[PDB]
Amino acid sequence: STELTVQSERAFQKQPHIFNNPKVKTSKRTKRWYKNAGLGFKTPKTAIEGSYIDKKCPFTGLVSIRGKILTGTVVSTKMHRTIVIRRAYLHYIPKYNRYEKRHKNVPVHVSPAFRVQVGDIVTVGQCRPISKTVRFNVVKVSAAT
Amino acid sequence: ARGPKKHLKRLAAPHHWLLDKLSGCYAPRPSAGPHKLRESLPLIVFLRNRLKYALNGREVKAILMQRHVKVDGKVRTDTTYPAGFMDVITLDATNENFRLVYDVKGRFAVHRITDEEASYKLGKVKKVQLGKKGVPYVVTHDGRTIRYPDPNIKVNDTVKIDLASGKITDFIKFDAGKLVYVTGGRNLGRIGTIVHKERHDGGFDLVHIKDSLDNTFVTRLNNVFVIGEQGKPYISLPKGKGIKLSIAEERDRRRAQ
Amino acid sequence: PRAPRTYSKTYSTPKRPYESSRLDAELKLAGEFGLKNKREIYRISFQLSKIRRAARDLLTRDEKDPKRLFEGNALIRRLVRVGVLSEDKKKLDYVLALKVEDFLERRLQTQVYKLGLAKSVH
Amino acid sequence: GISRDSRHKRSATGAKRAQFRKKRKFELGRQPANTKIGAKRIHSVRTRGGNKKYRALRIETGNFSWASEGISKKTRIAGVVYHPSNNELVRTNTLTKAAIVQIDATPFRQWFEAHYGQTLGKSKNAERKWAARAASAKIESSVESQFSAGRLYACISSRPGQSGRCDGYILEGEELAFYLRRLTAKK
RNA sequence: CCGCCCGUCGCUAGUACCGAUUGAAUGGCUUAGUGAGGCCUCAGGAUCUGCUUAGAGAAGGGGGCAACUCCAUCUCAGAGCGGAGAAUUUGGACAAACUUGGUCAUUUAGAGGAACUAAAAGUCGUAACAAGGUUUCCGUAGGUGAACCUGCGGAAGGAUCAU
RNA sequence: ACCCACUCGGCACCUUACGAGAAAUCAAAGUCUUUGGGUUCUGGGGGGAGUAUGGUCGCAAGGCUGAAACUUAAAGGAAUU
RNA sequence: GUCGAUUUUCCAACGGGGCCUUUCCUUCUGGCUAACCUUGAGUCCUUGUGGCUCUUGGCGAACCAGGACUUUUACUUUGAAAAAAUUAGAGUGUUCAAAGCAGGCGUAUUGCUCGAAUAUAUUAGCAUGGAAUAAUAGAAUAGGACG
RNA sequence: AUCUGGUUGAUCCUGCCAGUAGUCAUAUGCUUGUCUCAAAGAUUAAGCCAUGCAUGUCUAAGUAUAAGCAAUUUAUACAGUGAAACUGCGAAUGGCUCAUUAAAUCAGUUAUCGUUUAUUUGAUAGUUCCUUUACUACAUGGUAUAACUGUGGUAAUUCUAGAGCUAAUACAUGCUUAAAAUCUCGACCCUUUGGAAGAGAUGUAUUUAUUAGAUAAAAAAUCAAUGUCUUCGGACUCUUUGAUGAUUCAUAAUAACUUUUCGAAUCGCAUGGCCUUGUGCUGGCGAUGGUUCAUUCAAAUUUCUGCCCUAUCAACUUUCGAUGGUAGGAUAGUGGCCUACCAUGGUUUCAACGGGUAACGGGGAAUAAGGGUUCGAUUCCGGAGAGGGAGCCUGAGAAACGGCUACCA
RNA sequence: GUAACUAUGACUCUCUUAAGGUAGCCAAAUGCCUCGUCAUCUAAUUAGUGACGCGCAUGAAUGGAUUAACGAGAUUCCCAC
C-alpha cells in the first residue's frame, strides 16, 4: 500500500529460499509461496494472486500466528504497513459496584492482502515481536460501510 | 537470578509430600531427572516419610548407596532422584515393588505390587517425530525415547514399556470408552472413563470424563492419562480406585469402623 | 528463618469496661465456679462468640446443603460430647442460645466439686 | 558493552524510563568487526554456552551456488559493486549479507564447457553425455556477457561476520535485471 | 445595660512573607570540551623456539684410514613456518571521572520593610448587639488617630408580610 | 370589542393542611434508616484566611484559582423563660 | 409399604427435554447407520398384531471429521488451572490451650491400621449454558435475499 | 450491627474536642514466681567498621618416588593409607538489605512456529589412512610445567625470580572397517529395441543454494521422450510420504563449503571361553568422557488486564531512535537493539508528560454487621544491590563484587 | 511641653506675616558634621551597591518618583585579554 511499486527499495524484494528457475519453461514464470494462517482465518485471494512481499504477513511471510486473537476499531492508518486499534473496555471497581472506560491503543501490522480505513473492526492475532511496539498481525477485517 | 537455584525452602515445597511445617527450613530439592520437580517424589521422602524405613536423611544414604532401591530396574543412588508417576521403586530386600500412583485425594500413596506386574510402566505418549536418518521415535512423560514405535502410536496415547529391555510391547489409543487416570488438576488421583473430548485449536483441548457413579468432570488432556479400557486396567489401581467420595459419605465410611 | 509458628489469643476485653450490671453478673458467675480473674469469663465468652458466628454462618444459607449439614453436625457432635448441649437439643438453634454458664459447668474443678470428695469448689 | 536491551530507550508514550538493572550480560551486543576482501583471516568468539561464532576479517574464496544449474564452485571474489544498505560498504569493499559482488567466473566456465555444452561467452562417453544433454538449455543474454567479461555478478547469502564464510547465490533472471539497473543508475 | 463588645497605640513572645546580596549548599538532568580503564580491531615482534641433515674448517672430533667406529661431533650464510609470544601502539564502540556553564527541585543565611496571631487588658475613643441612639449589611470608590465616616447601586438576615 | 358563567393549556402567585424538618417553617424544603429517576457544582469545628506564594487575565483598581505553620473548646442555627 | 434405621399409591410443589399450532438448531460427503417408514422364507405358537435366525428399495440424530459460512459486545450460570504458609474449617485428650499433623488398636514375640480433608480467593484470561436489561448494524439511487 | 462527658439560665440541633475498645504496631515507666512458644539495629545512617569466621572439595573407578606413616607375610614398574600440587567440578546456590524503581518491578494468565540450557534421565556414532604389496596403533610429542630440590630479593601482600626435575581424562597431535547400494568420470562396437573394464566419492558437524516434505472428485482424443512385456493384433496394471489450528516444521535428496567440530592413545574390579601353548584370539559388570536429538533443573525475552498523591504538572517524544518501512550489523535468539537509507509518525482530559512518595511488588496484616479503612522493611514467591558509577575476564550460568580493572568518596 | 509604658500618636497652646513640606525620594551630581550607621562586595574598600533618615540646606511642570531602548557622558565590580 505504498503504492503501485513492488520494486521500490534499494534491495531486491524476494521471497526467501523461493527460486524462479529461469531455464525451466513455466508459462506464468511467477511462484508465490503462501500458507494457512490457521484457526479458520480464510487467506484472502488478494494475498495468493498479489505481487507484494511483506515478510511480516501472516500468509506470505515467516511469522506463524500463535497466542491470542484480539479485536478493535482502527484509529490511525498514517504509517507504512502498520495501523493503531483502540480496544474499548469497561474496568469494574469493586467499591462503587461500577465501571469506567479505558482506551489501550495497540499498534498492528497490516499486510497489503487487506485494505483498512478509520473506523473498521479488525480481528488481529499475536505473533513474534515485529518492532518495538507492534506484537500483533491483522488476519480479519470488517468494514461496516 | 544469576544461575539456576539449588535449595528448596520447606514451605515452598509441593504440598502432596505432606512435609511437616516445622523441623528444618529446607525441603529435598529433587535433582533433575525423568519427572518435573513439582510432579515428582524424591527417594528421600519415599523411604523416610511414606515407608518409615529410615529415620533421617542420613540413614536413606546408607539405604541408597547399598544398591537396593531400583526406580526403573536400575540402581539409582541419588537421594533426591525425582521418582514420579508410574515408576516402580523396587526394594530387593523385603521383596517390595511399589508403583507410585496417586491416592484419590491427590498424593502418592504406597501401592505394593507383584513382580509379574512390576516389569512395565505405561508411558503416556508425548511428542512423536522423525529423528536424524529419518528414524521415527516416541518420547513418553518419563523422558524415555523409543525408536521404531508402532506407526499407529500418535500423541496422547499410552505405551507399555518392557523396563527390563526398554522397548514398547502394547499401546492404547485415546478416544471415547477408554479408562483414564487424572495426573494433576484438583481431579488429581481420580480414575474414570472418557465420554467425549473437544477440539480447542491452540486453546487447551478439554475432555469430559465420567467415573463409575455417572459423575462427569472436565479435565485437560495433558493432566489426563490413558490407563486402559473398561473392566481390565493395565495396572493395579490403589484401594479406592479414584472414585472421589464427598465429605459426608467419606466421613460415614471412616466412622462405620 | 524457617516458618511463622501460628499463635492466636483466646480472650476478649468487653467493649465498655465500667458497667454495674456486667460487673455484678461476672463477679457472680466467677464466685459460683471459683475463678481467678475476669479473663476466664472473657475467654468462655470469646469461645461462645466463635461458635455463635460459626452457627449463624451455617444457618443464614440454604437448608439440606452439604456445607450446613457437615459443619453443623460436626459442631453439635463436638458440643454434645463436651456436654454443653444434652441428648435432646441437636437442632443448630439450641446452640445459638448456649449461655457461657453451660461451658463453666463443665470445667474440671466444677466436676470434681459435683462428683463429691471436693468440699467447696475452691 | 553494546546492550540490545529495550528497558533503556524512551517508552512508546514518550516517557524516559528510569534506569534499573546495572546493564546485564544476556542483553550483550558486540562490535561489528567488518570483513574486507582478500588475504583470508578468521577470529573466533565464544558466545552463550561455548557455541563458537566465527567473525571473518579479510575473507577470500567464497562458495558460490549457480542454482539454475544446481551446482556450487569455490571462487575468488574481486570487489563489491553495489549494496542496498550503505554506499560506504562498497568503497571499503566490505563483505556482508545481500552485498552484490564480482567473482572470478572461471571454474563456472570450466564446468559448463566440460559437462554441458561448448565455450560460453561466444572420449565416447563424454560425447554421449553432450549428445544426451542435447541443448539442455541456454542463458538468456544477461549471464552470457559476464563469463567473457571475466567476472560475473553474485550476491552474498552467508552472514560472514557470524558464520565466518562468504558463500552463496550467483545472480540470474529479473534479480540480475534489477541489480543491473541499480548498478548502472549510480555507476 | 453598672450587660456585652470593636479597632489604633504601647509592653511582651511567637509564626509567616518581601528583601540588595551576580546569596550559599545539596541533588537530579544537561550544553561544549578533556577523557582513565578494560573489550573489538590495524600493526608491532623482547624473547623462547622444532625439523633445519643446512656447506662449515673439527684429524678417540664412535672400541682410531673409514660421506670418523657423524656428538645435543666444530658453527651458523641461511632458511622456510610449525610456531608460540610480552611491552608497545593504530583506530572503534562501551563509558566512568574531570572542567564548564545551563535549568529544575529541595534546604537555607540576610541589614531592613510591611505584617498576622496570642497574652494581662495598660492608653484612646465606643464601632456592633435595643430604632445601640446615624437601622444593619454586601459590592465598589474616596477620606480619616483608631474604631470608622461618606458617595453610588443593591439586600432585609428591618424597626414595615397593610390602603 | 368590553363584560358574565363553565372549561382547559401555560404564568407570576396567594389561603387553609394528614408528610418533612433542629426548629423558623413548605406547592416543595413532601414521595428519605420502608435509605437509589437523570445529572452538574459545593462543604467537613472556630480562627489564621480568601491571607501568603505560583501561575493566569487586566491600563490600573483588581479578578480567577488558593495553601500551610501556629492557635483554640467551642464558634454557630432555631426556639424558650 | 417394615424390620429406633427404609417406599407405594389416592396424591401435589419445584425446576425440565421432545412436539405442532405459519415457527426452525445453515445444512452436506463419507463413515455407522442400532435401526422399520418396510418384508426375505415367515412362524417357533392356550383361540392371540404374544415374538425374532435375520435382513431389497430409505430412514440418520447412536454417530463423528471433514467440509464451510457465521452483523459484534456487556451481563449472568457452571467448569477448568488457580503455589504453600495465612484465613475459615474437618479429624485427633499435645495433662488443657495457643499449637502440632500427629496418632489409633491388637498376639501388644513375626504386628495391623485410620489420617495429613474440604471451602473462599467475587479483577483479567480460557471454556461452558441462558439470551430478560443495555447499545450496534442489516433492504432506501436496492450494489437487498433465495434457486 | 451499642456509644457517653463538653457551647445554654434551661432546650432542641449543626458540629467538633474529649472519653471508650483493639492493634503478629513502636517506644517508655513501674512491677514480675512457674510452663509452652517466640520476634529482635527495618524507620534515623544502602553511614563507617577493628578483629575471628562465613567456599571448598577424593572414590576401587584422573595424575603419585611426600626425601610422610606404612612394614608384612600379593608387590621388582606401579597396587595400602595418606600431605602438597596439577586436573575436574563448585564457588552464579545460600544468606543479607530494601537504596533505586510508579506500566517499571509485581500478581494472575499467555507465547516461544523467536531462542540458549552445565548437570540429570533417555536414546544416539563399522564411513576419519587417501590411491591399495611389508605408513606409530601391542599405543605419538615436550613442540611443558606444577608440586618437589636448591640459589635469592623487598620492611612489607594469598609477591614470585632464576636454575634442576617429573606425570596426567592437563596441553598438542594421531591410525586401526565389514557389507551393500547409489552416484559421477571411461577400458569397450555399430549404424543399433544401440550397451561397459575400472577409478573415485557418498559418517557426523558448519555454511549456502536447489529439490522433496503429497491430495474434495469419473472419463477422453492426440503428438513426442517408446524402455521392458509383445502371450510380435498390441499390454505395461500395482507407481510412494510423519506432525500441528498454522510453518520454509521434523526429516530426507542434489551441488559443494570449512583456519574440517566429533569419533574414546582414559581408569577400577573379576580374570572367564575355545587350543592353533601364542606366554596369542575372544570376553562380563562398571567409572569417566564424548557428538547430535529429546528430557530435567533453568534462563531470556513475551500476550492480556490491574498499581499510591498531585492540573499551584496540558501538551509530551523527533540534531544525540522518537513511530513505522527496506536492507544490513549485532545477539543465544525476536526487536530501532544498533547502523545506513526512506516516510512523519507515536502518547494524551478514559489524565499523556512532569513533580512527590518517610513506595520494592505480591502471598498477606490490624480493625470487624454489611460495605470498608490503614498498613505489608520482616520467616514464602519474585525484583534489585553489595560505598557510588562504568567496564570485563573465567565459565553452562555473572556484567559476580567473601572475582579483576579504572575513575569519584 | 503632659500621658500607657519606659521613650510619647491622647490631650493642651501659639501659629512669621498665608500656609506650616503632603505623596514621594536621599549621605542622592543636593548631608556641614562625614571616612554618618547597618548589611554587602575585598585579606584589607575615605570607593561601589542595598537599606536606615529630626534631611546643616530633599520634594512635586523653579516639576517629584519610576523608566525599556539609546550614550565617544560620570562611576563600581566581574570574565577574557
UniProtKB/Swiss-Prot annotation, chain A:
Organism domain of life: Eukaryota
Entry's Gene Ontology BP terms: maturation of SSU-rRNA from tricistronic rRNA transcript (SSU-rRNA, 5.8S rRNA, LSU-rRNA); ribosomal small subunit assembly; translation
Cross-link (Glycyl lysine isopeptide (Lys-Gly) (interchain with G-Cter in ubiquitin)): K14, K45, K55, K56, K78, K95, K104, K132, K140
Annotated localization: Cytoplasm
Quaternary data: Component of the small ribosomal subunit (SSU). Mature yeast ribosomes consist of a small (40S) and a large (60S) subunit. The 40S small subunit contains 1 molecule of ribosomal RNA (18S rRNA) and 33 different proteins (encoded by 57 genes). The large 60S subunit contains 3 rRNA molecules (25S, 5.8S and 5S rRNA) and 46 different proteins (encoded by 81 genes).
Additional record remark: There are 2 genes for uS17 in yeast.
Name assigned to this protein: Small ribosomal subunit protein uS17A
Gene name of the encoded protein: RPS11A
Curated annotation (Swiss-Prot), chain B:
PROSITE patterns the record matches: RIBOSOMAL_S4E, S4
Residues where Phosphothreonine is found: T114
GO terms for biological process, alphabetical: cytoplasmic translation; translation
Example of a GO MF term: RNA binding
Location relative to the cell: Cytoplasm
Ranges for domain S4 RNA-binding: 41-104
Record text on subunit structure and interactions: Component of the small ribosomal subunit (SSU). Mature yeast ribosomes consist of a small (40S) and a large (60S) subunit. The 40S small subunit contains 1 molecule of ribosomal RNA (18S rRNA) and 33 different proteins (encoded by 57 genes). The large 60S subunit contains 3 rRNA molecules (25S, 5.8S and 5S rRNA) and 46 different proteins (encoded by 81 genes).
Record function comment: Component of the ribosome, a large ribonucleoprotein complex responsible for the synthesis of proteins in the cell. The small ribosomal subunit (SSU) binds messenger RNAs (mRNAs) and translates the encoded message by selecting cognate aminoacyl-transfer RNA (tRNA) molecules. The large subunit (LSU) contains the ribosomal catalytic site termed the peptidyl transferase center (PTC), which catalyzes the formation of peptide bonds, thereby polymerizing the amino acids delivered by tRNAs into a polypeptide chain.
Remaining remarks: Present with 573 molecules/cell in log phase SD medium. There are 2 genes for eS4 in yeast.
Name of the featured protein: Small ribosomal subunit protein eS4A
Highest classification ranks of the organism: Eukaryota, Fungi, Dikarya, Ascomycota, Saccharomycotina
Swiss-Prot record, chain C:
Record key words, sorted: Cytoplasm, Isopeptide bond, Nucleus, Phosphoprotein, Ribonucleoprotein, Ribosomal protein, Ribosome biogenesis, RNA-binding, rRNA processing, rRNA-binding, Ubl conjugation
GO MF terms, alphabetically ordered: rRNA binding; structural constituent of ribosome
Keyword NAD carried by entry: no
BP-aspect Gene Ontology terms: maturation of SSU-rRNA from tricistronic rRNA transcript (SSU-rRNA, 5.8S rRNA, LSU-rRNA); positive regulation of translational fidelity; ribosomal small subunit biogenesis; translation
Coiled-coil residues: none
Domain of life assignment: Eukaryota
GO CC terms, sorted: 90S preribosome; cytosol; cytosolic small ribosomal subunit; nucleolus; small-subunit processome
Family (UniProt): Belongs to the universal ribosomal protein uS4 family.
Purpose: Component of the ribosome, a large ribonucleoprotein complex responsible for the synthesis of proteins in the cell. The small ribosomal subunit (SSU) binds messenger RNAs (mRNAs) and translates the encoded message by selecting cognate aminoacyl-transfer RNA (tRNA) molecules. The large subunit (LSU) contains the ribosomal catalytic site termed the peptidyl transferase center (PTC), which catalyzes the formation of peptide bonds, thereby polymerizing the amino acids delivered by tRNAs into a polypeptide chain.
Note: Present with 63300 molecules/cell in log phase SD medium.
Protein's recorded name: Small ribosomal subunit protein uS4B
Species of provenance: Saccharomyces cerevisiae (strain ATCC 204508 / S288c) (Baker's yeast)
UniProtKB/Swiss-Prot annotation, chain D:
Classification via Pfam families: Ribosomal_S8e
A single cellular component GO annotation: 90S preribosome
Entry's Gene Ontology molecular function annotations: structural constituent of ribosome
Keywords assigned: Cytoplasm, Phosphoprotein, Ribonucleoprotein, Ribosomal protein
Modified residues (Phosphoserine): S65, S68, S72, S85, S141, S142, S145, S148
GO biological process: maturation of SSU-rRNA from tricistronic rRNA transcript (SSU-rRNA, 5.8S rRNA, LSU-rRNA); translation
Main location: cytoplasm
Record-listed Phosphothreonine modification sites: T61, T106
Region (Disordered): 1-30
Cellular compartments annotated: Cytoplasm
Record has Membrane as a keyword: no
Oligomeric form and interacting partners: Component of the small ribosomal subunit (SSU). Mature yeast ribosomes consist of a small (40S) and a large (60S) subunit. The 40S small subunit contains 1 molecule of ribosomal RNA (18S rRNA) and 33 different proteins (encoded by 57 genes). The large 60S subunit contains 3 rRNA molecules (25S, 5.8S and 5S rRNA) and 46 different proteins (encoded by 81 genes).
Misc remark: Present with 15900 molecules/cell in log phase SD medium.
Family: Belongs to the eukaryotic ribosomal protein eS8 family.
Protein name, entry field: Small ribosomal subunit protein eS8A
Organism: Saccharomyces cerevisiae (strain ATCC 204508 / S288c)
Lineage: Eukaryota, Fungi, Dikarya, Ascomycota, Saccharomycotina
Gene behind this protein: RPS8A
